[PDB]
Design an enzyme around this catalytic site. Structure first.
Site, PDB file in Angstrom:
ATOM      1  N   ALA A   8     -11.905 -16.832  -0.290  1.00 22.97           N
ATOM      2  CA  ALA A   8     -12.113 -17.190   1.120  1.00 22.97           C
ATOM      3  C   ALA A   8     -12.721 -18.568   1.353  1.00 22.97           C
ATOM      4  CB  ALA A   8     -12.952 -16.153   1.803  1.00 22.97           C
ATOM      5  N   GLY A  13      -7.500 -19.803   1.981  1.00 21.62           N
ATOM      6  CA  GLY A  13      -8.400 -18.674   2.158  1.00 21.62           C
ATOM      7  C   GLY A  13      -9.270 -18.778   3.398  1.00 21.62           C
ATOM      8  N   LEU A  60     -12.435 -13.286 -10.833  1.00 21.01           N
ATOM      9  CA  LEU A  60     -11.225 -12.729 -11.465  1.00 21.01           C
ATOM     10  C   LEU A  60     -11.397 -12.464 -12.958  1.00 21.01           C
ATOM     11  CD1 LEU A  60      -8.634 -14.950  -9.575  1.00 21.01           C
ATOM     12  CD2 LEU A  60      -8.809 -12.460  -9.293  1.00 21.01           C
ATOM     13  N   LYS A 162       0.855 -18.267 -12.490  1.00 21.11           N
ATOM     14  CA  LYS A 162       1.335 -17.684 -11.242  1.00 21.11           C
ATOM     15  C   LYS A 162       2.574 -16.852 -11.480  1.00 21.11           C
ATOM     16  CE  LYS A 162      -0.102 -17.862  -7.783  1.00 21.11           C
ATOM     17  NZ  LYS A 162      -1.209 -17.455  -6.894  1.00 21.11           N
ATOM     18  N   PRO A 185       4.519 -19.765  -0.937  1.00 22.26           N
ATOM     19  CA  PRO A 185       4.501 -21.014  -0.215  1.00 22.26           C
ATOM     20  C   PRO A 185       4.952 -22.178  -1.084  1.00 22.26           C
ATOM     21  CG  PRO A 185       2.287 -20.052  -0.444  1.00 22.26           C
ATOM     22  CD  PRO A 185       3.186 -19.424  -1.453  1.00 22.26           C
ATOM     23  N   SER A 200      -3.917 -29.054  -3.087  1.00 21.18           N
ATOM     24  CA  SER A 200      -2.564 -29.403  -2.669  1.00 21.18           C
ATOM     25  C   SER A 200      -2.477 -30.790  -2.032  1.00 21.18           C
ATOM     26  CB  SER A 200      -2.011 -28.348  -1.710  1.00 21.18           C
ATOM     27  OG  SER A 200      -2.926 -28.078  -0.665  1.00 21.18           O
TER      28      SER A 200
HETATM   29  N1  NAP Z   1      -2.142 -24.927  -1.237  1.00 17.77           N
HETATM   30  C1  NAP Z   1      -0.902 -24.921  -1.712  1.00 17.77           C
HETATM   31  O1  NAP Z   1      -0.042 -26.019  -1.591  1.00 17.77           O
HETATM   32  C2  NAP Z   1      -0.388 -23.698  -2.397  1.00 17.77           C
HETATM   33  C3  NAP Z   1       0.985 -23.549  -2.537  1.00 17.77           C
HETATM   34  C4  NAP Z   1       1.496 -22.365  -3.055  1.00 17.77           C
HETATM   35  C5  NAP Z   1       0.629 -21.350  -3.428  1.00 17.77           C
HETATM   36  N2  NAP Z   1      -0.729 -21.521  -3.305  1.00 17.77           N
HETATM   37  C6  NAP Z   1      -1.601 -20.409  -3.679  1.00 17.77           C
HETATM   38  O2  NAP Z   1      -2.499 -20.230  -2.612  1.00 17.77           O
HETATM   39  C7  NAP Z   1      -3.722 -19.697  -3.090  1.00 17.77           C
HETATM   40  C8  NAP Z   1      -4.898 -20.515  -2.561  1.00 17.77           C
HETATM   41  O3  NAP Z   1      -4.663 -21.878  -2.807  1.00 17.77           O
HETATM   42  P1  NAP Z   1      -5.592 -23.021  -2.209  1.00 17.77           P
HETATM   43  O4  NAP Z   1      -4.825 -24.268  -1.974  1.00 17.77           O
HETATM   44  O5  NAP Z   1      -6.356 -22.387  -1.123  1.00 17.77           O
HETATM   45  O6  NAP Z   1      -6.580 -23.346  -3.410  1.00 17.77           O
HETATM   46  P2  NAP Z   1      -8.174 -23.509  -3.431  1.00 17.77           P
HETATM   47  O7  NAP Z   1      -8.677 -24.343  -2.322  1.00 17.77           O
HETATM   48  O8  NAP Z   1      -8.502 -24.017  -4.775  1.00 17.77           O
HETATM   49  O9  NAP Z   1      -8.615 -21.990  -3.334  1.00 17.77           O
HETATM   50  C9  NAP Z   1      -8.652 -21.199  -4.490  1.00 17.77           C
HETATM   51  C10 NAP Z   1      -9.903 -20.352  -4.405  1.00 17.77           C
HETATM   52  O10 NAP Z   1      -9.904 -19.474  -5.502  1.00 17.77           O
HETATM   53  C11 NAP Z   1     -11.241 -19.218  -5.871  1.00 17.77           C
HETATM   54  N3  NAP Z   1     -11.341 -19.011  -7.319  1.00 17.77           N
HETATM   55  C12 NAP Z   1     -11.073 -19.916  -8.315  1.00 17.77           C
HETATM   56  N4  NAP Z   1     -11.284 -19.316  -9.500  1.00 17.77           N
HETATM   57  C13 NAP Z   1     -11.683 -18.059  -9.258  1.00 17.77           C
HETATM   58  C14 NAP Z   1     -12.031 -17.041 -10.110  1.00 17.77           C
HETATM   59  N5  NAP Z   1     -11.986 -17.279 -11.418  1.00 17.77           N
HETATM   60  N6  NAP Z   1     -12.410 -15.819  -9.583  1.00 17.77           N
HETATM   61  C15 NAP Z   1     -12.448 -15.617  -8.218  1.00 17.77           C
HETATM   62  N7  NAP Z   1     -12.089 -16.649  -7.379  1.00 17.77           N
HETATM   63  C16 NAP Z   1     -11.721 -17.842  -7.894  1.00 17.77           C
HETATM   64  C17 NAP Z   1     -12.074 -20.412  -5.425  1.00 17.77           C
HETATM   65  O11 NAP Z   1     -13.138 -19.964  -4.614  1.00 17.77           O
HETATM   66  P3  NAP Z   1     -14.690 -20.055  -5.083  1.00 17.77           P
HETATM   67  O12 NAP Z   1     -14.831 -21.331  -5.889  1.00 17.77           O
HETATM   68  O13 NAP Z   1     -15.615 -20.008  -3.882  1.00 17.77           O
HETATM   69  O14 NAP Z   1     -15.021 -18.809  -5.876  1.00 17.77           O
HETATM   70  C18 NAP Z   1     -11.147 -21.207  -4.547  1.00 17.77           C
HETATM   71  O15 NAP Z   1     -11.766 -21.356  -3.299  1.00 17.77           O
HETATM   72  C19 NAP Z   1      -3.620 -19.684  -4.613  1.00 17.77           C
HETATM   73  O16 NAP Z   1      -3.323 -18.357  -5.020  1.00 17.77           O
HETATM   74  C20 NAP Z   1      -2.459 -20.597  -4.921  1.00 17.77           C
HETATM   75  O17 NAP Z   1      -1.791 -20.198  -6.089  1.00 17.77           O
HETATM   76  C21 NAP Z   1      -1.247 -22.673  -2.777  1.00 17.77           C
HETATM   77  O1  ERD Z   2       1.111 -23.923  -5.480  1.00 20.01           O
HETATM   78  C1  ERD Z   2       1.575 -25.037  -5.331  1.00 20.01           C
HETATM   79  C2  ERD Z   2       3.008 -25.229  -4.933  1.00 20.01           C
HETATM   80  C3  ERD Z   2       3.534 -26.298  -5.883  1.00 20.01           C
HETATM   81  C4  ERD Z   2       4.975 -26.534  -5.653  1.00 20.01           C
HETATM   82  C5  ERD Z   2       5.531 -26.982  -4.452  1.00 20.01           C
HETATM   83  C6  ERD Z   2       6.921 -27.167  -4.388  1.00 20.01           C
HETATM   84  C7  ERD Z   2       7.714 -26.896  -5.514  1.00 20.01           C
HETATM   85  O2  ERD Z   2       9.056 -27.065  -5.477  1.00 20.01           O
HETATM   86  C8  ERD Z   2       7.139 -26.462  -6.689  1.00 20.01           C
HETATM   87  O3  ERD Z   2       7.870 -26.177  -7.809  1.00 20.01           O
HETATM   88  C9  ERD Z   2       5.773 -26.283  -6.746  1.00 20.01           C
HETATM   89  O4  ERD Z   2       2.763 -27.512  -5.848  1.00 20.01           O
HETATM   90  C10 ERD Z   2       1.391 -27.470  -5.817  1.00 20.01           C
HETATM   91  C11 ERD Z   2       0.652 -28.630  -6.026  1.00 20.01           C
HETATM   92  C12 ERD Z   2      -0.739 -28.560  -5.972  1.00 20.01           C
HETATM   93  O5  ERD Z   2      -1.450 -29.698  -6.172  1.00 20.01           O
HETATM   94  C13 ERD Z   2      -1.387 -27.346  -5.709  1.00 20.01           C
HETATM   95  C14 ERD Z   2      -0.629 -26.194  -5.491  1.00 20.01           C
HETATM   96  O6  ERD Z   2      -1.206 -24.984  -5.239  1.00 20.01           O
HETATM   97  C15 ERD Z   2       0.748 -26.266  -5.550  1.00 20.01           C
END
Ligand code: NAP
Ligand code: ERD
EC number: 1.1.1.219
Length: 324
Positions: A8, A13, A60, A162, A185, A200
């Protein structure tokens, strides 16, 4: 009703928690460290926080740590994930906790008996990581692990974790009759409420910061607005007709078109005009959100909306310089 949001404190989150509280949900938000003021202040300042938000300490890496947060919830959004691209021990620090954390949460859910649907935030990296890029990707497509491990592109370890977590989750779900949905996403861009640089946006704004290592992800890029993505999460949790995987992606273009858009919107930054190994003839690769839109979901934001939101917020927070 009462839902659990893992991770969160993060980019997606925290926005999701905001939108959930706005919609009248009672939210249980998990974080690894609740004494961290930069991680929690933005959650506590949310409207309805005092009355509708609780914080839970969970990791985790620790077996059963999500047990207490999940007991009593009617739904769970698993958004948390290990985000280190530059890890010296990829197997233990990233890959393993991602999969076991995921399976642990699914078991935590099964043990709760109250959880009616688990929504997992997956990644486009589970879809299109292969040597040859198709012109359009859909929910039937999976990444090539052998290629991923061998090429070792930027974020390979993250893509592997992932992909493996999602495949393991589907196996557990099918075998134990758990109502499980994943959302895939692409690159999430937009304004945000957290105080540090969203991972990202290191990728999305590479053209501005000159971070060439991240170019490989945006070379043939697909993008979605943070707020569209979080609304898609709520939509799929609430929609009873929803089943399986869902791509959530609104725009696609090659690095050249993206860098163009940015030069035109931000003349003050030093944004390249040419990128090595990239020509105007490079095919744009699309992620198809048709499964999602067929349900009734509407994207509301444009590519310009995403990037202006992202750059403006970064500036506001002192995470990008005002100019170059
Ligand atoms: N943003 C994108 O472009 C993108 C695209 C596709 C998918 N996703 C997916 O979206 C989700 C969130 O991404 P985001 O961009 O929000 O990343 P983020 O800002 O890094 O958020 C990830 C969160 O996970 C928590 N975390 C890290 N390690 C952990 C652990 N070992 N145990 C429990 N919590 C942990 C951290 O919270 P704390 O440090 O407070 O514990 C962090 O706030 C991820 O599952 C990612 O794979 C993101
Ligand atoms: O989780 C992602 C998504 C990732 C991505 C976007 C578009 C694509 O075609 C692909 O193969 C992967 O790119 C990322 C780059 C970041 O810096 C953080 C992410 O969570 C992601």
């Amino acid at each position: 009703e009462t839902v659990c949001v893992t991770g969160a404190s993060g980019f997606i989150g925290s926005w999701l928690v905001m939108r959930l509280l706005e919609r009248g949900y009672t939210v249980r938000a998990t974080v690894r460290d609740p004494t961290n003021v930069k991680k929690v202040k933005h959650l506590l300042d949310l409207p309805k926080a005092e009355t509708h938000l609780t914080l839970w300490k969970a990791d985790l890496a620790d077996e059963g740590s999500f047990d207490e947060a999940i007991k009593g919830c009617t739904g769970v959004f698993h958004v948390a994930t290990p985000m280190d691209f530059e890890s010296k021990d990829p197997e233990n620090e990233v890959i393993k906790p991602t999969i076991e954390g995921m399976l642990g949460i699914m078991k935590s859910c099964a043990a709760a008996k109250t959880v009616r649907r688990l929504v997992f935030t997956s990644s486009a990296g589970t879809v299109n990581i292969q040597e040859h890029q198709l012109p359009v990707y859909d929910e039937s497509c999976w990444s090539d692990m052998e290629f991923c491990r061998a090429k070792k592109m930027t974020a390979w370890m993250y893509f592997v974790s992932k992909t493996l977590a999602e495949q393991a989750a589907w196996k557990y779900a099918k075998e134990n009759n758990i109502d499980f949905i994943t959302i895939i996403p692409t690159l999430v861009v937009g304004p945000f409420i957290m105080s540090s640089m969203p991972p990202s946006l290191i990728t999305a704004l590479s053209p501005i910061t000159g971070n060439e290592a991240h170019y490989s992800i945006i070379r043939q890029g697909q993008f979605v607005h943070l707020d569209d993505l979080c609304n898609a999460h709520i939509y799929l949790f609430e929609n009873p007709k929803a089943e399986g995987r869902y791509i959530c992606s609104s725009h696609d273009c090659i690095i050249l078109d993206l860098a163009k858009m940015l030069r035109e919107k931000y003349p003050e930054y030093n944004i390249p005009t040419e990128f090595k190994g990239v020509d105007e003839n490079l095919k744009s690769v699309c992620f198809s959100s048709k499964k999602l839109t067929d349900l009734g979901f509407e994207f509301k934001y444009s590519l310009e909306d995403m990037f202006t939101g992202a750059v403006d917020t970064c500036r506001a927070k002192g995470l990008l310089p005002p100019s170059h």
